[PDB]
Design a protein around this nucleic acid. Structure first.
Ligand SMILES: [Mg+2]
Ligand SMILES: [Mg+2]
Length: 729
RNA sequence: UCUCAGC
């Protein structure tokens, strides 16, 4: 069965609304014009003189026609005149089909977008945000707009409506002031700017400052008008500065003026900042109890507005008034095997403290390592090392005095030279300490520590050695990371799938550097899933993932003198629409690449697609308060189709947990669905940078970290000597 | 890098 057993049935409730699945009499039609005018809007206008024969309730998408009632004649031929052409254009009617299951959705999304437009909602980006009731945050010139993201699809329980509250931050002030910050260019490159006088939301494409707002443009049959005059005529406002660089948008020569503009979306500066996130996230990160009512009061609003009320009764569909109520299951909390003893996770599924009191399973001993630092931070670094020697013996590690090396100063060449005169085979780890964060020196250093000289490093920033409180915990968080960078596993969980490799793939979208789309590739190399062989992929990915799979298979063979019987490939980084693309292109490549070795080697494969950015929300509930559900809750019925499941593994403190969507796009493994769901739950714990369950499984997040490291700082492939270790953490 | 129509 699709529904696995072995959990605990907890009453959950997702944010899906079951549309009334009785939408018949929706006969699709077709129109044929022996004058083939190549404009859908012109065709619609041409047939508009015959709208009385149908009614307002029609959908003419250029070629077809959707009507909630029998068309007047499925072979009727009328003559239509054109105010421009003047020809007696043919009018055609077709009894193509009453759509069964394919174009029903494409109709419902169109009419539902029309409905949401009737509620005075605007289309910004892809979803819909309100404008009457912003949530004022007048502390940063920010201003939030409530909004909703909706979709309708053929989920197993019929036709369901997705609905999840969104939020779109918009700048209270103007844009020219934002253009003051040029010298203290390539940033307004897709920034969704909107105006205020009408709240019409443009999307910007190209900026050429070679123009002035006083220029005139040929509009409305040779009537040149200047922007200063056009805007004062059409909106009765003035312009203070007459030299601002205009903004250009073109529908898929609209020259905007950046005094009436106002950006949406915090733009890399509020993004790279600790200040504004704590200010915004109090509102953006909505707790589940508020979100449930922000959902229900949307339905109370939707069943009161006149256009919204009438449109449903026109097409006949009855939108229900309360979210779904399913019966999810809660997988048992999983034991965490340490070296000597083991602790079960709490309901919170976090062992951040119990990992600081037990022994790691395999500790690599730091007999000889080094530290780099500056005069300004010599004392703090020395104390950090002195008490790092004090915290390792508790946790089962064993460290000794490092070759305490002082760089000359903070210039990057000094660090480069100091590393180059220091690297030797008789070495374990070089632990570097920087005064201030800067990607130039960081990248120039990590290239040397990850390409030229394969020495696993560890960068620390000076502010983190507070030497007041965040030193014991920082040392206990860096010792455990340094242990893993040396190929020593910390904790493990009983995974009863004997002799099965597990692979994890994720990609990193870059738009500037060639769009190479670095993709990581991480696979286990031991039957306990604690040591990961991590390679990388490069292409301008088709051919390199087969090479990485073959190399990882060889590596697993070397360690275990065997070959895996199963290969679970938790593919991630799929686009929102290519969820079937992998099921046809790369799965055949993975089956083909097995041919290099093996006596006709037959791995029982399973390619699982992992999706994070979804819009489902599983609210667990006991009573009448839809709270967050405890991590480890599986839902796979009446919400998913084609054998895929939703899993709540993350845990948050503020907000609603987003369950993660795993699609099983290839299943030859003979694994019962129960076992694969449980396994996908176990791999959640195995991330050695956060003791406790995380969003995606261990290999997927490992691969994401590796891909981000390669893309943002390395821009090459790491040395193949480092691969058997988790040099990336 | 202690870490999760409009112009
Ligand atoms: Mg993804
Ligand atoms: Mg790290």
């Amino acid at each position: 069965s699709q529904r696995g057993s072995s959990g605990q049935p907890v009453p959950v409730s997702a944010n899906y609304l079951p549309l009334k699945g009785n939408m018949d009499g929706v006969f699709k039609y077709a129109v044929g014009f022996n004058p083939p005018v190549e404009d859908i809007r012109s065709r619609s206008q041409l047939l508009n003189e015959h709208k009385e024969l149908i009614g307002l309730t029609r959908v003419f998408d250029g070629s077809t026609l959707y009507v909630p009632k029998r068309i007047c004649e499925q072979r009727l031929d009328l003559m239509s005149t054109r105010q421009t052409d003047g020809a007696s254009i043919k009018v055609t009617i077709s009894l193509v089909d009453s759509v069964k299951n394919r174009d029903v959705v494409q109709l419902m999304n169109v009419i539902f977008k029309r409905i949401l437009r009737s509620l005075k909602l605007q289309r910004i980006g892809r979803d819909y945000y309100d404008a009457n009731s912003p949530l004022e945050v007048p502390q940063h010139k920010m201003q939030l707009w409530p909004g909703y993201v909706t979709a309708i699809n053929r989920h197993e329980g019929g036709l369901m409506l997705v609905l999840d509250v969104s939020h779109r931050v918009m700048k209270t002030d103007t844009a020219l002031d934002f253009l003051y910050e040029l010298y203290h260019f390539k940033q307004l490159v897709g920034s969704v700017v909107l105006t205020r006088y009408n709240n019409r939301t443009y999307e910007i494409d190209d900026i050429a400052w070679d123009k002035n707002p006083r220029c005139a443009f040929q509009d409305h049959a040779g009537s040149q008008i200047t922007f200063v005059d056009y805007y004062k005529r059409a909106y009765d406002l003035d312009i203070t500065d007459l030299e601002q660089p205009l903004l250009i948008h073109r529908p898929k020569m609209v020259c905007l003026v950046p005094e009436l503009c106002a950006m949406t979306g915090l733009t890399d500066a509020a993004r790279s900042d600790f200040k504004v996130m704590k200010d915004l996230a109090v509102h953006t990160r909505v707790p589940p109890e508020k979100r449930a009512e922000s959902f229900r009061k949307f339905i109370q609003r939707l069943n009161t507005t006149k256009e919204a009320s009438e449109l449903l009764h026109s097409w006949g569909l009855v939108l229900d008034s309360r979210m779904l109520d399913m019966q999810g299951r809660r997988l048992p909390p999983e034991k965490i095997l340490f070296k000597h003893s083991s602790i079960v996770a709490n309901m919170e599924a976090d062992w951040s403290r119990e990992c600081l009191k037990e022994h790691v399973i395999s500790a690599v001993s730091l007999l000889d390592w080094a530290v780099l630092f500056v005069r300004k931070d010599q004392g703090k670094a020395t104390d950090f090392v002195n008490m790092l020697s004090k915290v390792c013996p508790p946790i089962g590690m064993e460290v000794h005095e490092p070759k305490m090396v002082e760089v000359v100063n903070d210039r990057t060449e000094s660090y480069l030279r100091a590393l180059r005169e220091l690297i030797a085979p008789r070495l374990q780890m070089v632990v570097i300490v920087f005064p201030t964060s800067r990607d130039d020196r960081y990248s120039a250093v990590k290239k040397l520590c990850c390409i030229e000289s394969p020495i696993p490093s560890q960068v620390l920033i000076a502010r983190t050695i507070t030497q007041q409180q965040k030193l014991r915990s920082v040392a206990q968080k860096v010792a455990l990371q340094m242990n893993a960078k040396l190929g020593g596993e910390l904790w493990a969980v009983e995974i009863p799938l004997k002799s099965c490799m597990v692979v994890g793939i994720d990609v990193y979208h870059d738009k500037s550097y060639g769009n190479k789309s670095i993709a990581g590739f991480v696979a286990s190399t031991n039957p306990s899933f604690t040591r990961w062989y991590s390679r990388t992929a490069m292409q301008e990915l088709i051919h390199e993932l087969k090479l990485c799979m073959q190399a990882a298979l060889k590596k697993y063979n070397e360690m275990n003198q065997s070959l895996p019987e199963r290969i679970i490939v938790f593919r991630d980084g799929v686009g929102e629409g290519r969820e079937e693309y992998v099921s046809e292109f790369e799965v055949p490549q993975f089956n083909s690449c097995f041919s290099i070795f093996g006596e006709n080697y037959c791995p029982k494969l399973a390619v699982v697609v992992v999706q994070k950015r979804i819009t489902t929300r599983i609210f667990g509930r006991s009573g009448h308060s839809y709270d967050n559900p405890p991590p480890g809750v599986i839902v796979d019925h009446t919400i998913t189709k084609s054998y895929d499941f939703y899993l709540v593994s993350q845990h948050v403190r503020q907000g609603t947990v987003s369950p993660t969507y795993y699609r099983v796009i290839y299943d030859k493994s003979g694994l019962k669905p129960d076992h694969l769901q449980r396994l996908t739950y176990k791999l959640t714990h195995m991330y050695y940078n956060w003791p406790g369950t995380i969003r995606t499984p261990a290999p997927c997040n490992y691969a994401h970290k590796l891909a981000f490291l390669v893309g943002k700082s390395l821009h090459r492939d790491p040395a193949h000597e480092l691969s058997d270790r988790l040099f990336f953490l």
